[PDB]
Symmetry: C2
Subunit: 33 residues, 2 copies
């Protein structure tokens, strides 16, 4: 089912995006003392 | 085209797994920096 696969991709992209945001927060912190 | 979508999912899972490893590595580094 295509919508089911498309939903799964959408869910993984969303996770990916959230993971990148966490990485960006962690690197911001590393930039301070 | 379903195999194409299924491939994309495998590729996003792999990307996401690697981001989780990077997060783990960043948190360790912040704990020792």
């Amino acid at each position: 089912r295509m919508k089911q696969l498309e939903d799964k991709i959408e869910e993984l992209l969303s996770k990916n995006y959230h993971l990148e945001n966490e990485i960006a927060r962690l690197k911001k912190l590393i930039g301070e003392r």
